[PDB]
Design an enzyme around this catalytic site. Sequence first.
Site, PDB file in Angstrom:
ATOM      1  N   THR A  39      -0.878   3.047  -5.928  1.00 15.11           N
ATOM      2  CA  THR A  39       0.225   3.085  -6.880  1.00 15.11           C
ATOM      3  C   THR A  39       0.801   1.687  -7.060  1.00 15.11           C
ATOM      4  OG1 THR A  39       0.770   5.388  -6.431  1.00 15.11           O
ATOM      5  CG2 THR A  39       2.575   3.982  -7.154  1.00 15.11           C
ATOM      6  N   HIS A  43      -5.401  14.507  -3.971  1.00 15.41           N
ATOM      7  CA  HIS A  43      -4.481  13.912  -3.011  1.00 15.41           C
ATOM      8  C   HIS A  43      -3.833  14.993  -2.184  1.00 15.41           C
ATOM      9  CE1 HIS A  43      -1.967  11.167  -1.075  1.00 15.41           C
ATOM     10  NE2 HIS A  43      -1.342  10.608  -2.095  1.00 15.41           N
ATOM     11  N   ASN A  97      -0.504  11.803   2.753  1.00 16.29           N
ATOM     12  CA  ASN A  97       0.657  10.934   2.635  1.00 16.29           C
ATOM     13  C   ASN A  97       1.969  11.643   2.344  1.00 16.29           C
ATOM     14  OD1 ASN A  97      -1.081   8.793   3.208  1.00 16.29           O
ATOM     15  ND2 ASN A  97      -1.387   8.295   1.029  1.00 16.29           N
ATOM     16  N   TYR A 152       2.771  14.159   0.266  1.00 21.88           N
ATOM     17  CA  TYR A 152       3.052  14.670  -1.064  1.00 21.88           C
ATOM     18  C   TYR A 152       2.861  16.186  -1.052  1.00 21.88           C
ATOM     19  CZ  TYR A 152       3.673   9.835  -1.928  1.00 21.88           C
ATOM     20  OH  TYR A 152       4.156   8.539  -1.857  1.00 21.88           O
ATOM     21  N   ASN A 175       6.736  10.044   4.443  1.00 16.70           N
ATOM     22  CA  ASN A 175       7.315  11.172   3.712  1.00 16.70           C
ATOM     23  C   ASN A 175       7.615  12.373   4.601  1.00 16.70           C
ATOM     24  OD1 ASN A 175       7.655   9.965   1.169  1.00 16.70           O
ATOM     25  ND2 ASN A 175       5.578  10.455   0.544  1.00 16.70           N
TER      26      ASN A 175
HETATM   27  C1  LIG Z   1       1.538  -0.233  -2.699  1.00 23.15           C
HETATM   28  C2  LIG Z   1       0.748   0.926  -2.141  1.00 23.15           C
HETATM   29  C3  LIG Z   1       0.444   1.989  -2.982  1.00 23.15           C
HETATM   30  C4  LIG Z   1      -0.267   3.089  -2.509  1.00 23.15           C
HETATM   31  N1  LIG Z   1      -0.533   4.149  -3.345  1.00 23.15           N
HETATM   32  C5  LIG Z   1      -1.276   5.223  -2.915  1.00 23.15           C
HETATM   33  C6  LIG Z   1      -1.593   6.275  -3.766  1.00 23.15           C
HETATM   34  O1  LIG Z   1      -1.252   6.280  -4.953  1.00 23.15           O
HETATM   35  N2  LIG Z   1      -2.320   7.332  -3.286  1.00 23.15           N
HETATM   36  C7  LIG Z   1      -2.732   7.346  -1.971  1.00 23.15           C
HETATM   37  O2  LIG Z   1      -3.367   8.300  -1.539  1.00 23.15           O
HETATM   38  N3  LIG Z   1      -2.432   6.310  -1.145  1.00 23.15           N
HETATM   39  C8  LIG Z   1      -1.733   5.241  -1.609  1.00 23.15           C
HETATM   40  N4  LIG Z   1      -1.463   4.207  -0.749  1.00 23.15           N
HETATM   41  C9  LIG Z   1      -2.025   4.255   0.652  1.00 23.15           C
HETATM   42  C10 LIG Z   1      -3.349   3.417   0.593  1.00 23.15           C
HETATM   43  O3  LIG Z   1      -4.393   3.974  -0.200  1.00 23.15           O
HETATM   44  C11 LIG Z   1      -3.954   3.138   1.969  1.00 23.15           C
HETATM   45  O4  LIG Z   1      -4.283   4.372   2.578  1.00 23.15           O
HETATM   46  C12 LIG Z   1      -3.026   2.348   2.878  1.00 23.15           C
HETATM   47  O5  LIG Z   1      -2.408   1.258   2.193  1.00 23.15           O
HETATM   48  C13 LIG Z   1      -3.705   1.818   4.150  1.00 23.15           C
HETATM   49  O6  LIG Z   1      -4.825   1.024   3.834  1.00 23.15           O
HETATM   50  P1  LIG Z   1      -4.690  -0.584   3.932  1.00 23.15           P
HETATM   51  O7  LIG Z   1      -4.190  -0.955   5.317  1.00 23.15           O
HETATM   52  O8  LIG Z   1      -6.071  -1.132   3.673  1.00 23.15           O
HETATM   53  O9  LIG Z   1      -3.689  -1.012   2.849  1.00 23.15           O
HETATM   54  C14 LIG Z   1      -0.733   3.122  -1.203  1.00 23.15           C
HETATM   55  C15 LIG Z   1      -0.438   2.057  -0.366  1.00 23.15           C
HETATM   56  C16 LIG Z   1       0.300   0.962  -0.824  1.00 23.15           C
HETATM   57  C17 LIG Z   1       0.589  -0.182   0.111  1.00 23.15           C
HETATM   58  C1  LIG Z   2       3.087   7.717  -6.675  1.00 21.63           C
HETATM   59  C2  LIG Z   2       2.105   8.149  -5.831  1.00 21.63           C
HETATM   60  C3  LIG Z   2       1.287   9.284  -6.334  1.00 21.63           C
HETATM   61  C4  LIG Z   2       2.193   7.837  -4.324  1.00 21.63           C
HETATM   62  C5  LIG Z   2       2.589   6.398  -4.032  1.00 21.63           C
HETATM   63  C6  LIG Z   2       2.479   5.931  -2.624  1.00 21.63           C
HETATM   64  C7  LIG Z   2       1.576   6.660  -1.674  1.00 21.63           C
HETATM   65  C8  LIG Z   2       1.445   6.185  -0.275  1.00 21.63           C
HETATM   66  C9  LIG Z   2       0.779   7.810  -2.194  1.00 21.63           C
HETATM   67  O1  LIG Z   2       0.010   8.393  -1.452  1.00 21.63           O
HETATM   68  C10 LIG Z   2       0.951   8.298  -3.604  1.00 21.63           C
END
Ligand SMILES: Cc1cc2nc3c(=O)[nH]c(=O)nc-3n(C[C@H](O)[C@H](O)[C@H](O)COP(=O)(O)O)c2cc1C
Ligand SMILES: C=C(C)[C@@H]1CC=C(C)C(=O)C1
Lengths: 399, 399
Positions: A37, A191, A194, A196, A251
Amino acid sequence: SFVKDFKPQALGDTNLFKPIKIGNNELLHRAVIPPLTRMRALHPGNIPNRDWAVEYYTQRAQRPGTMIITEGAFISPQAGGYDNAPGVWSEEQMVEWTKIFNAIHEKKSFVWVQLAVLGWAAFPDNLARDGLRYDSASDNVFMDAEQEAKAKKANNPQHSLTKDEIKQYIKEYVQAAKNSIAAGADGVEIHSANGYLLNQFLDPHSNTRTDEYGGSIENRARFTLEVVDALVEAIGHEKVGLRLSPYGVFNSMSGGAETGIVAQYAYVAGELEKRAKAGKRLAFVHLVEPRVTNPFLTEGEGEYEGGSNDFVYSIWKGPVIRAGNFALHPEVVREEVKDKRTLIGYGRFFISNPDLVDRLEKGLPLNKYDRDTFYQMSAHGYIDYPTYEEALKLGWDKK
Amino acid sequence: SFVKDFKPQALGDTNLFKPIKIGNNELLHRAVIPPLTRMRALHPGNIPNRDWAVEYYTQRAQRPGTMIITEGAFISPQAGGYDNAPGVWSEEQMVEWTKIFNAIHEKKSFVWVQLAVLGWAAFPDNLARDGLRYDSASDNVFMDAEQEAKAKKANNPQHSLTKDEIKQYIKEYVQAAKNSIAAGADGVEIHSANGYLLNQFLDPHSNTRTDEYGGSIENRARFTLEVVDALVEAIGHEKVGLRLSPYGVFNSMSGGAETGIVAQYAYVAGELEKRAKAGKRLAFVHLVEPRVTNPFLTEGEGEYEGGSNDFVYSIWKGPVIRAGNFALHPEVVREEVKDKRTLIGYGRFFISNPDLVDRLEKGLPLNKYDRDTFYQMSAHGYIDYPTYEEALKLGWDKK
Ligand SMILES: Cc1cc2nc3c(=O)[nH]c(=O)nc-3n(C[C@H](O)[C@H](O)[C@H](O)COP(=O)(O)O)c2cc1C
Ligand SMILES: C=C(C)[C@@H]1CC=C(C)C(=O)C1
Ligand SMILES: Cc1cc2nc3c(=O)[nH]c(=O)nc-3n(C[C@H](O)[C@H](O)[C@H](O)COP(=O)(O)O)c2cc1C
Ligand SMILES: C=C(C)[C@@H]1CC=C(C)C(=O)C1
Ligand SMILES: [Cl-]
Ligand SMILES: [Cl-]
Ligand SMILES: [Mg+2]
Ligand SMILES: [Mg+2]
Ligand code: NA
Ligand code: NA
Ligand code: NA
Ligand code: NA
């Protein structure tokens, strides 16, 4: 600048650089862009950014044969509640998504849409403004005090879904998946991680229901599995993956403090393998590692050492994508990819390194990320991170 | 003679030779004698062998500070069905057990009684002779065709326990545990492994019930956990362990072919840790490894490579005894005991090596076992296996 004290390792001699097939896609390497995101979608209507989103994804598709999972995309207005995250329900959205998918494919890479539903993580005042509910599994446990209070102030108290409302979400997942494929995506990721909505059903802290959707392992898993089955029917198992975060606490999920948490996820994995053995194997299971229980904590913080995701491999026999603090730890990746069905998702460092895959192969320094622009309405911190060559020209090898 | 092509390794430099406390017992090393049925008890009355059992256990207690788990002992006549396995319900039995426990304690070692209930593995004709039922979880699935037919011929068809009958077994477990402690045992192990009655309830192949004791993970685990709780109440958590074999197929259990099998066992482990965190931690969990899915197959046969017991360690945080083909694999033990709460059970090679612990410490050759006398009414193959010194005198270093 480059991350100061990082000691890179070239990973080209590992399975990270062996091709693998995921769903219909022949990946040329196993470094995956997990869903990230970025909050550049525009209001009203949750429209993918008309100015910058194509370029962002084009940059990160540059290494041929890369699997990209999109930022979470809302399946419907009711599933949302953040004004600057995109949806996949409307014509206006899909116009933009089509451009993004085409651009990724032009780079010979692949794109999977993550289908997102916020539940209690949504902003209840945004939802109230738009005439929408503030939804979760239950109505007597809340994400935090602030969210509970915002909901009450907005005259939109947290609402425990009815069976009919769960069915409505399922219809929306189905249509969102159809929209995604029709617009050119290679597949979708459900998804269920995390914290949700689906995770809110999986977790016994957030799910205090006493109907068939709560009160036991099988009941808590019901909604997630109904979504899996609905999407498998609609677009095919080869176009569907599932994301889980067994040890996550983001969350207000339980993580390892819940002694039943491994069993809950083991049940889900077993049910997926049962379906696979009966002829409908999902393209992949994507796991967030206990390495990162909260992705908004700096790497090394919020690490849970009391659990491993390795149990999933005893159960599910298909591809597994693992994500969490792997960019700074090539020594860990080197060991994990010895398993021949393991892929590695790199999140935060794919934000800051459009050419991350080259850097991993060749053992190059990494661009430091700027967390302040992770969420921001700007090209800055989105499409202006340099490639390694560009960074050298800026003098970063001396900075 | 000694096992021909075995290359021993001295394990004295590993945690196998670090002391550890299990329940009330200060073990001096972590080589455990797992439960081993030997069929020397005498009929009538399932009496521990009056001639040889004291000597057998004395021999195997010789290394000070060894934990010994007895051969499975029937908690009641209805729980039995093998004429030459011992019970722990009668005065005549406990007279013999008291001598065995005293002898083990004289050697500065410890003894835990395994409490056994056969279910469908019992011989239905023996049970019919004694006016007893042939019991299991269900009445519509059988261990094998032979057992089903023997039951029908004996006019003793397999019977699905009623709730009252489950309650009766629980009373018997309680009294057997009390008998064991009063006679001097250090603790008891609840046998919920190897396809006997409790395992028959855990496994969805053998448990097709639709009451509260079947039809879900929590329901299938109910009887095992009710026994755990009843014994914890009766004699204390520090005097109770539990044995499980997640991947076992012996006695027609499902093993890894059942995609839900890890979740079923993860649930049990989680429920034990929940109790531990609430102040009642069991002395240990004893796991049979996927290394040995059937203990009557030669070492290396019946190995399941598709699963690991490592998941248990993410859940249960107390001591873990692991058993299965470890005597011939010191290289595996060396790695497993790096975990500081891991003990290793050595079964078949403790049958043939009364001084196994010395042999493990010092990296000595092992006596070959004679499987033909594993079950036999004889001192031969029971109390006449030599120590290393005795074997040298017999010329086995040249044979
Ligand atoms: C800014 C940001 C946005 C993220 N958005 C999502 C998301 O939309 N959906 C999701 O499943 N995880 C999301 N994550 C979790 C990441 O996909 C990932 O699991 C997490 O950052 C750990 O991996 P990394 O250490 O390589 O960043 C987000 C993480 C960050 C930091
Ligand atoms: C707006 C999203 C669907 C979320 C943003 C940040 C994280 C860690 C997600 O897993 C989804
Ligand atoms: C002759 C024999 C008798 C056994 N009796 C029991 C028993 O009474 N209770 C039990 O839980 N396991 C019993 N087992 C299984 C063992 O405790 C052990 O798990 C198995 O033999 C694998 O360990 P090993 O390779 O070191 O022999 C028995 C095994 C054998 C070979
Ligand atoms: C008679 C006994 C209680 C059984 C004998 C053999 C095995 C493998 C057991 O687990 C118990
Ligand atoms: Cl917002
Ligand atoms: Cl018999
Ligand atoms: Mg209400
Ligand atoms: Mg009948
Ligand atoms: Na924010
Ligand atoms: Na910002
Ligand atoms: Na036999
Ligand atoms: Na025999």
